[PDB]
């Protein structure tokens, strides 16, 4: 195409981060570029120091089936979820020093799939009870509820502008919801299977979805159409994690095939391969400035690729 | 910097949790699976009382520290959270043994075999065979003659060829037929016979998990 190729990028793990005892499901990066959160099914939500290869905190979870991680933009709180229906908010920066639970957000009737810290005191959670919900920390109740999906919602993407979020469901619908008015702005039903993972543009104009048919489909807001799809014929394994670059040129996609197939914005070529994991790549993220790339898989191994 | 001393010993804290999770590695993901009105909670409180949302039950004992994972309720798509449970030593499952002839709780209420056929379809859809060893549990056997007697069994069941209209023997043949509807014979389905109020359920699950640990130890120690 018109855009210049990025080429075959040889990407190496600078630092390997070991200490999770079981399969890692989700990770989230902190906004100050050295802090991340990542969680396993042992019952550990771990705050990791990136550049110097350390655990900042080790948070035991009463919910041992956690599927989500959220890290606050301020850096004071983290959010875990899971099969026990409750979004548990833990305070990192306390006088107490231990990372202790502040509020247990109960009320959901399904497994919590992806939560994201909307603000310092506002949390948006996607769940397996077909509904999404924005909650307030101090009240402990749903500020607003996002019903009306047909299938179970599996992923959630934080808006950088903190105004309009998008979530994807099992019934092949990617619905955008506005936080304030609470109603669905746009529906993307042009898909054949579940939305395993979702990630959203730094501008906010586009978002790519993870599927089970090796299609990293992008949908864009103002275009109102569903035409571009990132499909690799050789791969049949599904996309478990989706993450974006700062420029939006480079797409980070972790797969069921224990590899990270990394793509480009327009021409959609295999740009980079991050084959260093025994089991499927379950979670993948970048720092806000973009020095580090974190890949967690089910083999209890978390790797920084630079 | 000086963060090192905080973190390396935090390593062994997780290694302590590596030790304790190995100290409780007789626990695994004992995934109870079931349908509505099969009386799952009755057996759950039975196992709690005799040795005294997903809910985890610690059955800690000197012989075996034990923890049972109740996935009762949780109305959602099975496929997405069944990825979480690949490490199951046993997919514990309850079959509606007692209600031979009932219709589904959905508004139609006229289904012939489709309750049991739907349960069989949930039995079939198993995408992982690495460590799956279904521990089958039979339901109560308190009242037989009226329940067998009021509705004719043979017309509902297409392949059933057995004695009927007798109180005691037909119970044995219908139980042997239900435990003989095991489609996957390469693995071992560890069926047990227990009533709703019958005791010693913990010994049955303990023997079944010991036997499947023996089979996996035969497989991965090259001792097959």
């Amino acid at each position, epitope marked *: 195409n018109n855009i210049d190729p990025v080429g075959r990028i040889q990407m190496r793990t600078r630092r390997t981060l070991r200490g999770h005892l079981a399969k890692i499901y989700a990770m989230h990066w902190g906004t100050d570029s*050295r802090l991340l959160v990542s969680a396993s099914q042992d019952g550990k939500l771990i705050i990791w120091d990136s550049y110097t290869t350390n655990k900042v*905190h080790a948070i035991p979870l009463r919910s041992s089936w956690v599927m989500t991680c959220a890290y606050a933009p301020s*850096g004071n709180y983290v959010a875990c979820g899971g099969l026990d229906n409750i979004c548990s908010i833990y305070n990192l920066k306390t006088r107490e*020093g231990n990372v202790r639970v502040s509020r247990e957000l109960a009320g959901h009737t399904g497994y919590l799939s992806c939560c994201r810290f909307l603000d310092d005191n506002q949390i948006v959670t996607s769940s397996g009870d077909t509904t999404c919900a924005l909650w307030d920390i101090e009240t402990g109740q749903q500020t607003t509820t996002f019903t009306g999906h047909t299938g179970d919602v599996m992923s959630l993407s934080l808006a950088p502008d903190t105004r309009l979020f998008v979530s994807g469901a099992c019934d092949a619908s990617a619905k955008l919801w506005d936080v304030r008015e609470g109603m669905c702005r746009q529906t993307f039903t042009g898909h054949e299977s579940d939305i395993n993972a979702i990630c959203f543009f730094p501008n906010g104009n586009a978002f790519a979805t993870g599927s089970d048919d090796a299609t990293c489909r992008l949908f864009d807001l103002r275009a109102d159409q569903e035409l571009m799809t990132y499909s690799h014929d050789n791969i049949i394994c599904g996309i478990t994690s989706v993450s974006f670059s700062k420029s939006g040129r480079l797409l980070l996609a972790g797969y069921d095939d224990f590899n990270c197939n990394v793509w480009d914005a327009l021409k959609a070529d295999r740009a980079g391969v991050l084959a260093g994991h025994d089991n499927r790549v379950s979670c993948l993220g970048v720092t806000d400035d973009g020095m580090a790339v974190a890949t967690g898989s089910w083999d209890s191994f978390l790797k920084i690729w630079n | 910097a*000086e963060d090192k001393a905080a973190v390396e010993r935090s390593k062994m804290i997780d290694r302590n949790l590596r030790r304790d999770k190995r100290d409780a590695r007789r626990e695994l993901k004992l995934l109870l699976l079931g349908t509505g009105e099969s009386g799952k909670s009755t057996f759950i409180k039975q196992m709690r009382i005799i040795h005294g949302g997903i809910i985890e039950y610690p059955f800690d004992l000197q012989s075996v520290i034990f923890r049972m994972v109740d996935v009762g309720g949780q109305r959602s798509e099975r496929r997405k959270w069944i990825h979480c449970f690949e490490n199951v030593t046993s997919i514990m499952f309850l079959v509606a043994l007692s209600e031979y002839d009932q219709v589904l709780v959905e508004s139609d209420n006229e289904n012939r075999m489709e309750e049991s056929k739907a349960l069989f379809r949930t039995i079939i859809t198993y995408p992982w065979f690495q460590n799956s060893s279904v521990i089958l549990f039979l339901n109560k056997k308190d009242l037989l003659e009226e329940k067998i007697m009021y509705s004719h069994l043979v017309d509902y069941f297409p392949e059933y060829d057995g004695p009927q209209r007798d109180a005691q023997a037909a119970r044995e043949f219908i139980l042997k037929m239900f435990v003989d509807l095991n489609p996957d014979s390469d693995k071992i389905i560890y069926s047990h016979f227990t009533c709703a109020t019958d005791t010693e359920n913990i010994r049955f699950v303990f023997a079944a998990v010991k036997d499947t640990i023996l089979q996996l130890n035969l497989k991965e120690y090259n001792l097959v």
Partner: single-chain antibody, 232 residues
Framework: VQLVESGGGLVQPGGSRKLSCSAS????????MHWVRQAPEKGLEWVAY????????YYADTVKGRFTISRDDPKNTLFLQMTSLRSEDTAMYYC??????????????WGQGTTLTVSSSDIVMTQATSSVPVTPGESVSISCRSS???????????LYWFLQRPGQSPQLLIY???NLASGVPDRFSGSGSGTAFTLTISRLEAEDVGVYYC?????????FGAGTKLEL
């Protein structure tokens, strides 16, 4: 919430004591303990450090071997055993709580302080002025100097400012020369070069007229200087 110290009294030079820092209201197991002590007229000077969980025990270079200390983690207590007590150790001992990670706030909360009155290579920091009279509402700048360029390759300066209100603990104000501490208002601001440092106190109010203190933290020994007193 509360840190209590004990072990004071009047002992002749050459005796033995047991200082005891009992702490409560925080997870003491994951915290590192410092033992800053203060001369009755000269400024603070550091004594000892223990990491979280009784690991890397540190000491000041001149009292290496002469002081011993343990920590009772299940009861959250510090046992500073005092051996061969000299006449130059008349001091107000403090029990300092710190934690070390990225984005942390070490030296954040301080102990109340117990007295100890007996009868009768190394980086050194220095102050600018021993006493400065300032009426409130003038945005006073207080500066300090050192003997090393505290611009270590990890990308941050290991400089910690302080303030001691007269009578109680010297609470933290500025850590890493640009990050505001917890419990202090949004009026202080730190700056400085690699070696020289400064601190701007804008729109002064009541009770922020105690003696100020500065800290290098790049190496294991810790030096304070005489401490800049602020007057009216």
């Amino acid at each position: 919430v509360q840190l209590v110290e004990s072990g004071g009294g009047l002992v002749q030079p050459g005796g033995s004591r047991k200082l005891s820092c009992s702490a409560s209201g925080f997870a003491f197991s994951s915290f590192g303990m410092h033992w800053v002590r203060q001369a009755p007229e000269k400024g603070l000077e550091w004594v000892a450090y223990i990491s979280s969980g009784s690991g890397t025990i540190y000491y000041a270079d001149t009292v290496k071997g002469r002081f011993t200390i343990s920590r009772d983690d299940p009861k959250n207590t510090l046992f500073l055993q005092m051996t061969s007590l000299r006449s130059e150790d008349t001091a107000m001992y403090y029990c300092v709580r710190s934690i070390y990670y990225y984005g942390s706030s070490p030296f954040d909360f301080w102990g109340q302080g117990t007295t100890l009155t007996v009868s009768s290579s190394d980086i050194v920091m220095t102050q600018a002025t021993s006493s400065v009279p300032v009426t409130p509402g003038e945005s006073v700048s207080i500066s300090c100097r050192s003997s090393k360029s505290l611009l270590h390759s990890n990308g941050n300066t290991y400089l910690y400012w302080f303030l001691q209100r007269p009578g109680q603990s010297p609470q933290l104000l500025i850590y890493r020369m640009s990050n505001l501490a917890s419990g202090v208002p949004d009026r202080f601001s730190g700056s400085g070069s690699g070696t020289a440092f400064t601190l701007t106190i804008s729109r002064l109010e009541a009770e922020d007229v105690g003696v100020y203190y500065c800290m290098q933290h790049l190496e294991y020994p810790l030096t304070f200087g005489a401490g800049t007193k602020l007057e009216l």
